[PDB]
């Protein structure tokens, strides 16, 4: 139905404000199922369709849940028995809805879950989830599609992640915060997301030490009640702008920007030539007349964030020689280069590496989006293609980037969405 | 809005009618094309979505295309003054369009078509079909996503191809069979779908010698006119119903099945246990009481064809063992495995390798197809599947087959396709 | 303790001679155990170690094997009673001489052969090898490192190879020769060292049809008799000496050459900017004065051989611009590039594929081989590299090349053998 | 020369003591290059090959080094000034030696080191070392296989690093503790031996901030000074003994064993069914009756240490089941699995992933080990093969173990190391 009409040749100026994380949010709203009395209330909540699929599916778990887009703030009521039971209706759309099964067990004892089937990019399996699970005591049935977890007695254990997976980590913690006794999770994921939810179950009366560093610790709690909480911001769309003005030439500034949660993409942008400086007001990126090109890797936090991957393709893309990314954390994320190939973009992928030769000028032509972050790429190429990009599949930018034409118009970019 | 609901526990019996080959008809579509006089007919067209949608793209180039789909036969009548141009239009839906190029060049010296973009399976850029073009004597340019080709004189040249890409052989076959002198390509696609080209080209005026050769060489012509022909039968719809018999204790007659089309999957089959017969009327599958493990790797023909990757995996995710299947051809077409974890299957992927442990009792669950022969793979593995089965995403399945679900009916199968 | 010293900057003019194929040599010496009476001699047997530790392996099955250095020729008797084991000592040395396994069970019914163990390039196990063993009727037991394998009886049967490996072609079509009725091997290797042991079985007395196509078959004879053979020249020494003269600006005739065996490396080679011509000496290659970069990708026969992979990372080394190779055939074929870092060679490494960037000089320096062809290439190397290189592990290159530097002296080039 | 010969079938029962570290003592051998004044001594240093090496390797740069094997201590004095130069006799030997430029560049502005070449098991190259001596303002030149490096005035800077690359970090810290003014290092190694090179530069009067974290800081100091320092165990004996004990049914205590130092490879053995206990003494292993299959990935620390692979490999290969492997971190370290198919072991290899089937029993062969880890692994499927195994190239051996034999020996088991 809509597409993005992008004209290139325009250097982007100006501030941009950043919304809270679409990675946080989630699972802090799962987290809201723990509290057994009180309101929970969320600001900063981003206006994006997951956090409508999430609300959702806690809505089927028998709890209240307001959005008040306006103020950018949820409110949860979860003071009733809970169901626990999430349909692959749901599970089907967004697969991040399992995370409520920590909490469910943690609650009921109990949690049946829609088991996730294929995703475009090439996602995990959640066996490291239910390892978890086992570990404290859950019993895992698997019947019709769903995942089955009983647990009469969750109770404290030490747990070796295979993979610092982020979302077994959440899921994991979740049902910890009120297993008897302690849990020890070695080789947890350490993502500034899981330190944000560790920060709200802390509030909630909830023990968990060591977040963001390579062990957790949990210390089993009785009782979680409901508290007020601001959602951090989200680092993700922070870093897709301080790529767009590192190659346009620009000079942003990214708003409370906080530049410990972009130690890898700053660096590596700083390596292609851009500067960039922490300013009270937040991170300053003025992008430099001769694109270097760099090499990039991705990996587990404090690694380079595969979520950043699509978007710094872009810039290397147009940088001036060829530029290497290897993609460690998902095996089928390239296919935005596979589309780029018809915005003349001279690219070789074999396996988890792509090879991009920028000695070539973008040309604007009719690209479909294939996920979230490819979205915001071929829409970054646009910024830096010759003549008229139209970028299409604009459900999955809606996933994760509230506004995004709008942000980039006032950057002074010459971006448009419209009907077809 | 329709699914395929299976129940599981009944063994296949009976003959049964394979459709025209998908994988011939198209090229062979676009070859109508070199007819400067004449009408064509072709005989034994399946009724696929992908048949309808070459008839568009070749009457967008000021072509009649009539499609008797009661006589399976379609008539074409080229003889007018050709358009050049394919848009993305179709070539998003279809990227199998872009064989019209080798004929446009070769009538007009002039073709205009869209640059494909990304395919969920993963697969490789249209590199090789340039790299031919350009031998022949064609210029390339790229603008708003389109190639386009213009060759004065097409002038015949050694190509070699650094892989046997099926796609790429048929493009510049089609284009050598008018150049001046002779072509040569080197290290060309040997699947019998080039065969039946070379063979229908031959009729209608061309040189083309060492079809289904490691070398083919052609020797160019003046004027090409217009022929009868029968297509091929599918030795893929034909090598599912095998796989289908070998997995359900069945006993099937293949109705005319050309056994020399699946070697790797008859032999294959045998090591799993079946017994495989070559008789007067077909191919008899009769399939074991105990399933037994193997291992199998896709390669170009003569090698195992990634065509019969999927269904082969829902029978060894069925056999009494670990069996491990390596995917050598395209990137990503493990997708169908994802979703089978719905269904219990016990499969563990890293890269293009995937482990199946067999020891598992699949399970009924509601399963989305993510590509046509995931599609397929789905309803076999419904076959053995304990409870109800319900695949959707039937849009995929019918690029590809025709009357699934009633020709598995015929043989004792329960497989209702209905509304949602 | 040897090295080659190499200054560069030299063009190679003029006359090349080839020696007879050491990967024919190798399984046509234990082909030569089938000849129950009489003397059967080779002639174009090259002088390289493998041949002596070959014809080491077959005097300890007690049969006479007589090695005329001086008119390269290789005498053997076997037609005394043969022992039938092969030890360690001798297969850790030199895996090709498992290939006397299939000889031994067609005289003998039985053969006691030391499993081989790691090879640095990262081979391939012996499984396809036993899987032919089995299919004609032979038990196979392991035992202390060895493979037993007795058959009273070997019968024909259809075997499908999952790979078209060369070696177990080689050691089932020596069984199959002499079992009772009809053998059909699927997926065989298409080599031509595959034809040339296929040429002097028949001459033999055996039935071996259809080698070098997709399908071989085979109908068993009783008796085979002794004969004369020339081995047929190596395309792999021609080929090495192919990139020299295209690398250095040169014009070197390739004597008596068979194009027909070098396809895919004349293709690439004229790709990159060379001229060659079939002439009626051999074949012509003249080097560019601007090497073009080309990508490469090892394939089995008839692509791209992996035998002449490390040889043409020389050139691509040396293009001006970047290259990629990707090898599918073996695991870790690039220690070579490894080496060539301490030669200012630009390159990056992940998994199978390698990419060359040809904008730098090489320099020279002190480099070990690390295997047989990448001793080669470090020389070709040398010859392009400004400075002096010393090449060492020189045992590596003289398993596959006699007088490599006296050759390349004769045709100009700055090449000295010399102690240390 | 030499072998080790192992027997099977006997369970390990007793105390082992452990040495110091190889990989903590080689690079703060290198750090005591940086006291200018005074005599280093280091208390237990291991007996061990590459000690020997290294010692060498920092006398030719003008330096007195006295190893003292009866009391396990190196005394070093560095006082006077130091050559820079580090030749290809010894980085071709053991490419540890290169971390000797970090020192120098900090002591002289000038360091001229051998470029390494190909390693068995598929290194990096060393880019990240020269980024980050570029970084802190160091040039870089190579010539003749030399890497020489100047710098008048080292300075801080913000270092990131593409891969956590324990020989960059080691190498970088070694200059940065006397760089003027602030280094901070992003994606450091966390590595325990990381740890224990800052513990000593710190003694010595270097101020080096968050070793074990994600983020290393670093202020530039004027001078250090020598001290005392005991070598942190070796983490990787210790894990060797862990398995050895976990898979012959043993009750083996580790004396002092540090258990935050193996918390992976603890998880690891107790999901295959071991019991592992911290007491005062050590940590105790007692090997279950029936061992249990399990997964490993190789990651960076906190992941699964790639140095415990090879030994891992062992007890995944007779768990009662299909086990798999996957190396992250280094390309090509399955070559002691292929090695181990001599030994009856069923295992498939495909580029980074190798699939283990235990359900078979081992057997005795002759293997030749293939590196250091290789070699232990060989003998602990010695400890549980049937019949006779014969470990060879136990140069590798002792590369990483002291005494291997005998600890061995002490504990019960049937292993004899003797001439050939
Ligand atoms: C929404 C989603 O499924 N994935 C998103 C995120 O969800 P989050 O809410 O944090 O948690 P989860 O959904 O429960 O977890 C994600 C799913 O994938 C597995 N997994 C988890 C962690 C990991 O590192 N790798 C990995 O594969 C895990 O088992 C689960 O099934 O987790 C990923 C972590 O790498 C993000 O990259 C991804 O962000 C998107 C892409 C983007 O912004 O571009
Ligand atoms: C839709 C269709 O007909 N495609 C099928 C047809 O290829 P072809 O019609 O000749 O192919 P193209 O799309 O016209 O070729 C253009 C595109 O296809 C890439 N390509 C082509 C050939 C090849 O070997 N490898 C390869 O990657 C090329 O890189 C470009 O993107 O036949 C092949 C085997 O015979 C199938 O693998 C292929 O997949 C169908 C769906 C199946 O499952 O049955
Ligand atoms: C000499 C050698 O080791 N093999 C060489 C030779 O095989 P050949 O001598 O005829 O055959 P075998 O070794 O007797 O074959 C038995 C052994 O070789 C493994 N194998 C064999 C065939 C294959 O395709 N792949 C493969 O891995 C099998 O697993 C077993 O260990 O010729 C082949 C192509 O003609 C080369 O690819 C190969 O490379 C050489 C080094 C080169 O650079 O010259
Ligand atoms: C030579 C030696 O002693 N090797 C050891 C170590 O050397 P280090 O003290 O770091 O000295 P360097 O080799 O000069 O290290 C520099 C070079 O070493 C590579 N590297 C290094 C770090 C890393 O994380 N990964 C990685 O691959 C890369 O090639 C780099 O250029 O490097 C590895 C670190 O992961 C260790 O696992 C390895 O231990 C052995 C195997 C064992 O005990 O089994």
């Known amino acids: 139905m809509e597409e993005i009409i992008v004209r290139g040749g325009n250097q982007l100026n100006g501030t941009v404000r950043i919304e809270g994380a679409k990675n946080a949010v989630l699972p802090?709203?799962?987290?809201?199922?723990?509290?057994?009395?009180?309101?929970?209330?969320?600001?900063?909540?981003?206006?994006?369709?997951?956090?409508?699929?999430?609300?959702?599916?806690?809505?089927h778990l028998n709890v209240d849940v307001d959005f008040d887009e306006q103020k950018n703030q949820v409110t949860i009521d979860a003071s009733r028995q809970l169901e626990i039971e999430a349909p692959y209706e749901y599970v089907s759309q967004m697969r991040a809805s399992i995370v409520v099964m920590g909490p469910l067990l943690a609650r009921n004892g109990h949690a049946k879950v829609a088991m996730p089937?294929?995703?475009?990019?090439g996602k995990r399996p959640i066996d490291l989830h239910l390892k978890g699970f086992?570990?404290?005591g859950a019993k895992i049935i698997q019947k019709?599609?769903?995942?089955?977890?009983?647990?009469?007695?969750?109770?404290?254990?030490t747990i070796y992640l295979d993979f610092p997976s982020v979302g077994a980590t959440q899921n994991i913690?979740?049902?910890?915060?009120?297993?008897?006794?302690?849990?020890?999770?070695?080789?947890?994921?350490?993502?500034?997301?899981?330190?944000?939810?560790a920060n709200i179950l802390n509030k909630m009366g909830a023990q968990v030490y060591g977040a963001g560093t390579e062990t957790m610790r949990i210390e089993g709690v009785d009782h979680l009640h409901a508290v007020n909480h601001s959602?951090?911001?989200?680092?993700?769309?922070?870093?897709?702008?301080?790529?767009?003005?590192?190659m346009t030439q620009g000079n942003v500034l990214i708003a409370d920007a906080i530049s410990e949660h972009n130690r890898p993409l700053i660096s590596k942008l700083i390596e292609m030539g851009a500067e960039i400086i922490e300013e009270e007001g937040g991170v300053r990126v003025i992008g430099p007349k001769h694109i270097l090109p760099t090499d990039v890797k991705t990996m587990p936090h404090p690694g380079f964030?595969?979520?950043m991957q699509a978007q710094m393709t872009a810039i290397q893309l147009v940088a001036e020689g060829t530029?290497?990314?290897?993609?460690?954390?998902?095996?089928?994320?390239?296919?935005?280069?596979?589309?780029?190939?018809?915005?003349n973009a001279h690219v070789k992928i074999d396996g988890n590496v792509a090879i991009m030769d920028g000695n070539h000028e973008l040309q604007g032509a009719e690209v479909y989006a294939t996920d979230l972050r490819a979205a915001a790429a071929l829409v970054l190429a646009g910024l830096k293609a010759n003549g008229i990009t139209r970028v299409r599949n604009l459900n999955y930018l809606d996933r994760g980037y509230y506004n995004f034409h709008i942000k980039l118009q006032q950057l002074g970019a010459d971006v448009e969405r419209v009907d077809m």
């Open 28 to 59: 802090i709203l799962a987290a809201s199922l723990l509290a057994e009395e009180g309101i929970t209330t969320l600001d900063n909540v981003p206006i994006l369709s997951d956090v409508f699929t999430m609300n959702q599916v806690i809505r």
């Open 117 to 121: 089937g294929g995703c475009a990019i």
């Open 134 to 136: 086992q570990a404290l």
């Open 144 to 157: 019709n599609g769903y995942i089955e977890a009983i647990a009469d007695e969750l109770i404290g254990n």
């Open 173 to 197: 913690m979740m049902a910890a915060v009120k297993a008897k006794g302690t849990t020890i999770i070695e080789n947890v994921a350490r993502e500034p997301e899981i330190v944000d939810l």
């Open 231 to 246: 959602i951090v911001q989200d680092r993700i769309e922070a870093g897709t702008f301080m790529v767009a003005a590192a």
């Open 305 to 307: 964030p595969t979520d």
């Open 323 to 343: 530029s290497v990314v290897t993609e460690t954390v998902f095996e089928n994320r390239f296919q935005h280069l596979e589309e780029m190939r018809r915005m």
